[PDB]
Write a protein that binds this ligand. Sequence first.
Ligand SMILES: O=c1ccn([C@@H]2O[C@H](COP(=O)(O)OP(=O)(O)O[C@H]3O[C@H](CO)[C@@H](O)[C@H](O)[C@H]3F)[C@@H](O)[C@H]2O)c(=O)[nH]1
Ligand SMILES: O=c1c(O)c(-c2ccc(O)cc2)oc2cc(O)cc(O)c12
Length: 439
Amino acid sequence: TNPHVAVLAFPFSTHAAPLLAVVRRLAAAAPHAVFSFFSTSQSNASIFHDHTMQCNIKSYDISDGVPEGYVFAGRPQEDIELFTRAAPESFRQGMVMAVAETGRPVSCLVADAFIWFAADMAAEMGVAWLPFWTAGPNSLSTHVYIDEIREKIGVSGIQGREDELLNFIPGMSKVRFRDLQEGIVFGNLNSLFSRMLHRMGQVLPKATAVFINSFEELDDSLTNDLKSKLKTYLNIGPFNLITGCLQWLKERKPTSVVYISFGTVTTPPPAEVVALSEALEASRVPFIWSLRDKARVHLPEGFLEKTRGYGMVVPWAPQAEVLAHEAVGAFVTHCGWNSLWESVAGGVPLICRPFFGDQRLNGRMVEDVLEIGVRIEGGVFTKSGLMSCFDQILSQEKGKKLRENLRALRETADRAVGPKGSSTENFITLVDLVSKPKD
Ligand SMILES: O=c1ccn([C@@H]2O[C@H](COP(=O)(O)OP(=O)(O)O[C@H]3O[C@H](CO)[C@@H](O)[C@H](O)[C@H]3F)[C@@H](O)[C@H]2O)c(=O)[nH]1
Ligand SMILES: O=c1c(O)c(-c2ccc(O)cc2)oc2cc(O)cc(O)c12
């Protein structure tokens, strides 16, 4: 038969949405192929919200892995653990349904890199395995190098060595030991999530091709190194350059507003919430703060009332549109990959407060490599540190330089995704791979 591409999403944080975005581009490029998109019912409901969807894509709801009478212990990553333990069976049962509906065997397996066992499912089915790394090439590299990093550094702690450099890994000359993701050489190395990512790192070199929402020219040496470690390595982004709040912003002066958000699975600790509120109020800087409604309990009494004239606190913002708005002059961020590229699209300097995963590597890239943002003194929010960052960016020479660097970076990125761009050519390659029928 003609192709039937099974797509296996990771249904937590911002993973399923970028994967659907690529699938949409692939379905338009390969109109003869059918695509079956597997995630949980909650994930699909969110990302498929709303007549524009390519007719050759259909979503399928798979199990969240939670047993019927289950009582949560309240561990962190408990939902992830439940989903992950059931996922091999959950995805298999989804694909069975899609094969019966379409009458076409699965010819290709696209999956979030996190679904490491997708490699084994693909080998069993006799089809290509095409993992999507949803974050940056920095974190991809450290994952692919996990064994070597562990061998060089050891796994009994990095006490006294936090600021030592990872300069023995290509493209990582400015990354310190402390910048590494949890599960590499520190954190709970025996957790299910740590073991998952360890195996992923090992099996990624076996993929038909690994693809990523970045552009090759972000770092030539890193790109070259990854092409040496992987069978085929395809930069196909940035996606965002390819494809109440706004009314309020209309009346603000250019480059005057601070936007604040910490992604989809973080809130700063309550003391840091207080600290930001104090900095906003003391500077009287116009602001839009994306803050979980549940977390509003942590705002100092009177904060909302004193800032009503110049700031909004909302449970969800149209973030990409806010960052592209001329009134916005800075972005206080956890340094998640998707947020970073939206800020680059908008030409808005970052104020970085990374928490976990790849965010410290991304913060290092932003501050020391690309120079498109600044660090917060001590890596935690304080009233004085934040006030200094706002001044540096909105009112001082530093902000002009960061804006200049952002312009140049965005132009390079634009050319990667234009006609004859490196990401354009790489995407053709990926289309060719997903278009192949089964052996
Ligand atoms: O009020 C809001 C708030 C957010 N959004 C949108 O949600 C997305 C957040 O993506 P981002 O990658 O920055 O953060 P997060 O989901 O925590 O990332 C995880 O996944 C990332 C990629 O895998 C990884 O880099 C990171 O470390 C992880 F935490 C981004 O597209 C925002 O525009 C919004 O529209 N409105
Ligand atoms: O979604 C998540 C995610 O992507 C990452 C991550 C881990 C290593 C990386 O290199 C990059 C990202 O960690 C997480 C940790 C959580 O407790 C919950 C999550 O949802 C994520």
